[PDB]
Design an enzyme around this catalytic site. Sequence first.
Site, PDB file in Angstrom:
ATOM      1  CE1 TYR B 126      -2.638  -3.365   0.965  1.00 33.11           C
ATOM      2  CE2 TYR B 126      -1.541  -3.237   3.082  1.00 33.11           C
ATOM      3  CZ  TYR B 126      -2.315  -3.927   2.173  1.00 33.11           C
ATOM      4  OH  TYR B 126      -2.761  -5.191   2.462  1.00 33.11           O
ATOM      5  CG  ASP B 127       5.125   0.920  -0.629  1.00 41.82           C
ATOM      6  OD1 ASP B 127       5.531   1.426  -1.696  1.00 41.82           O
ATOM      7  OD2 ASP B 127       5.226  -0.298  -0.375  1.00 41.82           O
ATOM      8  CG  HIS B 163      -4.393  -6.928  -1.852  1.00 42.10           C
ATOM      9  ND1 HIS B 163      -4.126  -7.498  -3.077  1.00 42.10           N
ATOM     10  CD2 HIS B 163      -4.619  -7.955  -1.000  1.00 42.10           C
ATOM     11  CE1 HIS B 163      -4.191  -8.812  -2.972  1.00 42.10           C
ATOM     12  NE2 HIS B 163      -4.489  -9.116  -1.722  1.00 42.10           N
TER      13      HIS B 163
END
Lengths: 313, 997, 145, 139
Positions: B126-127, B163
Amino acid sequence: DNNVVECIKEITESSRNGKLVFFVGAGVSTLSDYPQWWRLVDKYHEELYGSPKKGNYSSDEYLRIPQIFYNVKGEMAFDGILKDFFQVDKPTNPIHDKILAMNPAHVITTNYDNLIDTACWKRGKYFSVISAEEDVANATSSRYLLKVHGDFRKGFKGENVVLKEDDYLNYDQNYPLISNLMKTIIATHTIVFIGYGLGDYNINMLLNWVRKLQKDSFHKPFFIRTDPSPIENETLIYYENKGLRIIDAASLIDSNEYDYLERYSAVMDLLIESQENKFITKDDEVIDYIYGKISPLFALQYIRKIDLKHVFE
Amino acid sequence: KRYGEKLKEVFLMLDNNVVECIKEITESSRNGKLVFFVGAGVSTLSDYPQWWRLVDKYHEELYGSPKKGNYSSDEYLRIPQIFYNVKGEMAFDGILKDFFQVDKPTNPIHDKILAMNPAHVITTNYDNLIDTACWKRGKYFSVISAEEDVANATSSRYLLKVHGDFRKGFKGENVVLKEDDYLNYDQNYPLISNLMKTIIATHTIVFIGYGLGDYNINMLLNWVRKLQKDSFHKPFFIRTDPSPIENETLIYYENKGLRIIDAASLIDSNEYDYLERYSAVMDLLIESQENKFITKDDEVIDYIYGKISPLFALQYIRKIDLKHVFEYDYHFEVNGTVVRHKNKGFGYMERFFELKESCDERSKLSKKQYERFNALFNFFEKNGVICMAKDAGTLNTSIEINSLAYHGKYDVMKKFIEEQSVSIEDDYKKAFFLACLGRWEESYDLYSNIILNSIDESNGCVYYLSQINRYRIYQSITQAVTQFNGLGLLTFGRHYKPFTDEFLARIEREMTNFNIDDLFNGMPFEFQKKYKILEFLSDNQFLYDDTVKLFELTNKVRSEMSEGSYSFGMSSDIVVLLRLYDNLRFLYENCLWSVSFHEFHQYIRNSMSLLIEKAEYERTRDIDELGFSFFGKKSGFFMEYYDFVNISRHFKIDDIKNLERSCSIDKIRFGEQEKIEEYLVGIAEEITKQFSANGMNVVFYTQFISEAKAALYFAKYVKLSEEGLGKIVKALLFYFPERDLDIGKRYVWLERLTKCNELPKSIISIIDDFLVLQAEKHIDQNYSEVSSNGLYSRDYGALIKHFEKNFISKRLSEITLCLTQDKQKQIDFLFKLLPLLSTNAKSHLLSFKSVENINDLMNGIRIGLIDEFTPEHEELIIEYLETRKVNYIVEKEKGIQTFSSNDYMSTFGIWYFLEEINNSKMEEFIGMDDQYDFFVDPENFDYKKFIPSWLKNYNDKLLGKIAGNKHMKHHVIEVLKERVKNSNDKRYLEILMNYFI
Amino acid sequence: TVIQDTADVYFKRKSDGKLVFTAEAQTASFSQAISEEKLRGGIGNKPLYILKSEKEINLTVKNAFFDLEWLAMTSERYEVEYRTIAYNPDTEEVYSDIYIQFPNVSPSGEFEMSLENGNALAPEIKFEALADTDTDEMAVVIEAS
Amino acid sequence: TVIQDTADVYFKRKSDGKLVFTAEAQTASFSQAISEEKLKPLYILKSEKEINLTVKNAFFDLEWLAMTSERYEVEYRTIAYNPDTEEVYSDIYIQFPNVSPSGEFEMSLENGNALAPEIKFEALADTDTDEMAVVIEAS
């Protein structure tokens, strides 16, 4: 029509960027006088019932009677009739090369012939012809001449193509990989339906698929309609509600009932010349267009006069 | 420093399976089929918060303390889930923001990932570290983290952040963190899931930053189980755990269908040395990314066979382009030396070349290897490749050999064209021959035929060449039709249309909106990979390298001239010549139509112009004693047959005039006189056949007349045979068009060939036939000599008189005896040829007419019928000078000008200066023209009108008389020495040296 | 700053007063060298002298626009109407114009057959002033006040 | 047939005699000027000279790199060649013991991938010696 010129702008922009992909139905194969499925249906019904169905055949008939031939007479008889009818070869009409004149990244089609294959043979457009489950992995080129229902490259046999009733009923399990690739090509590239016809089972399943998972997140597929007469309002509105950009060239270019090649070429050139035809009418449009080309130039400190050739095409 | 050394030590010891994985990853990157799955393990190296931290934090908030126990995979999902439902999504949002909102530096792995030029990049992170690593590299990956994103992607490349992520905001709704999110992945991310699945199916997969038992890994393995057997490329896993993967673990996870690479096996490291392991794997890949997989010195023949085997198709290719084959691993200089450029494995080619030197070592090869070596050695000779530069001895430079199309053979091309075409290669050469023969419509249509036939046969090479040739010939027809409709209708009078209007329309409709810039771009991937050598032809800016190399080599050679440096080794002229001949061979022998285009015209023109200029300079150059010590009697520049062909074809008249003027080319000895004589007689035969026969091709005419024009013009230097000279003169005088080569050009080129070799009596007969034809042609009064140069048939008669002291043109004499008063025009012309015609016929003409005016006085005095200037003749000159004077004073009000009157005026001034005419009225006409005053009364004449023509267009006896006169001598010598000083000219130098001083 | 006397060149048919094409002049190379019998070999006697000088005027013009009528309707001779302003060092801007004409000219260059992969827009074309036995050089200069 | 003067140059330290680097000869320029003569019972040949050289393919000696008023020597090695005898056993030894690492490349930052470290040289001089260049014949 204003709507039609808008479609022209979108389609030609996609062609400029290579984002355009063409769904080619059985109609294009009809133009080259490839054998039609309903002639095969008449043959099948004649052999089974002793004479073809006098009344018009329904879609249920169109699918089941090949299936009845598969069942009572056996599979090999089905393959035999396939071989006798579809072994004939015809050349590629100019419409295929004109379709390639748009410079598509992929060529999706439900056809089983290889008329587009031969057209890209002449035009030298190497689309990796995916036509089966195993064809997914061996895909050599990112570009795809995607045979949605397969073709008879290996041979004239039933399994090689989605023809009978079971294949339409069991398509999802039979072609999940081709289904995925098709779904994503529709997801990203701009799409055109040609020879597909309004009401065909394939267009129905595709419309269902797009309407299922996408929520204002689909690129409205285009449906270049090649019909004897202009599209009817009721049908056009109904199909648009489903979500589709239907381009009906009968009104734009007049054509009699059997002027099929004529209106095919008419719509194809409506696309081809329009992208090369830069329309500019007004006098204030002089400043508007020249600034639309020179707007980026203000950023650069100074630019050679010679380099402006690329700016104004 | 030794990290690369330690990694190359790791290489050459890696398990064959691991080596194969690395290779496939490599070739996938080169093919643009690499898809990098980037897990959280790579984010761990960058310090990005670990998920267990947030899971423990949720445990703390929920139960007031950490678990103090291992969180199972379900616990890693349940704990966030219970926290989300208990504290609400606000607390989830808060903790997400506090932990994950932290900038990091892109670790070495982040940069190395984007250095592979992946087709796409997938990450379950998610970075935005991968996003920044993507942006810094310059490329542009279209991010994807939402259903909305999948539809919106401007670029083909996509950054598939599965995601989701927090770019929309630091909220759990856009990320998969809790049991609810993982369970309903397909529900919330359907379109993303489908795009991900197709990307996996099509492109090669590389799991990095991951655990072998991750959730998505298992989902993808269920998806590949769904896939048809052997219809899936095993994805690539990069294990980075400090512990060594167990044999059982390897067996199991390979059974799942994964090609897993274990960093612990590759390299030894500490237990927390994660960065070292990740870097070891990725730098292994990056290290071996370009022709680094050399097996051994026994696999040399095998390796080079695989590298070169696809290259057997091309008949011959430039050695400069052989670098592309090995990815710049070896620079083959134009001479052929193998200059080592980049290599890691031993015996890349040096072993192969050693096998060439050592027969016994070649004998150690397997019979398969021996045959492969033989074929490779033969191919390298065919390309000219010289032995390894390390062992390069004296290297002979031999002229590159070409086919007949380059030669001046024309009947043989028709012979082939009528012959049956066995293969599409033969038909391709046929269409080339048609284009060379001017038959551009048949050439184009036949090229379309070969297009179809070849792509049917899947000859990727010949199809590529035919595509570009079809484009080139299309351009040829289009431009030629433009020039026809524009001027060619003017050149003859009525426009020729060999290319029928419907044929033009069909060609224009056949192709349009196509540029060869993408011709190479549209070809198959195997072709583009194996034949990058032919990309040089791809662009419309052909000669994308050779022209500037010629330019800088000119600059260097020019500087060498001006400073006069005693060069050694392969001088710039030699590399220029090698490039010239290699390009000529690679084009003409390969059969591309580009040979005739203007770019090649300029290139070859400038190449040979520079070579000849250096040939002149090195002759004139003075030698210092140290210079003589360096070398003496140095090699010159021989003009072989090939040089004559190149110069004759690719030059025009004016440029050859400039070359001959500047460089004394006649001093340069020519050689191979037999082959050049054959070429010249072939050109003469071709023009004789084209003009003897009424039937011909205007299309061929425009192209080949310039070729024939230059070839005949350059023909002066080489010697012709008696038969050759006869054929040349007959093709020139009787079968050369008046449209382009007028009578004056005809005469002066005849005079060039005359200077070249003496004219036997047969040639005298040819010139006499020409003269008699012109004498009869003047039967029409309308007929009159027309020639821009001002050189007439009387010139031809003057040549006969020069060669033959005694020769009577009996045909001309008979014509005279036939003339009458009504034929006064024939009478005038036959008078022009009086020295040739007989004695009784001379009396005939004398009785017919004589001098009557200034023009006829000039006519009469020219051949010299008048041995002494009569009083009447000088008086008539005075009368015409009165006419000129009245016309001048009348023209004094107007704008005075003199073009042809000034010729007569200067002649009379010179005769007065020579003292031939004593008529003093000449002095009365002083002042109308500067030359008149300069001659009749040089003393009074103002010594400021001296024209450069007067100072160079001189006469020898007139020069002696000028030198005699001191008054004129002072001023003329002053201005002449001044002029030579300002600009060094040979003609002024010879005025100075020979007569004045 | 640059040449401000743009030369308008009109090409008309000689047999009939029709305009063929209009272009823009670009250069004029004036060549003069004796080549009859090379540098030596002309007629020579003790009391006799003939000027054997032969000279040629070469021209080149750009941007040729051909008359619609001449295209439509389609030994032949053509003329020229070089139309330059007659400037001077004392006055580089003068109302008077210099009128040059070459009634004997042949439209003929070397650009024919020139194939530039990318079609060019500079159809530069050469010219050669024809001469006659009566007229050594037909080019004429006249300045209109 | 090519020019058979592939001379080898040994660039050694005059201070002690260590070998700096070896290369292959490329060119050698010789020029003079007499402008200064202009402003001679005490006649003087006012025609100074300047010997410019250049070499190619320099390979640096390992020790010279290792260790790192400084003068350097150049030893040219050329085989003798005559018109009468294309090849001659004798070898002409050319030496320029006094040169300078002439700065002329001067950070040529070309963007092409060409390995061309051409090195220019200037033959230095002194009051006692007009120019150190020396020639000798093996024959």
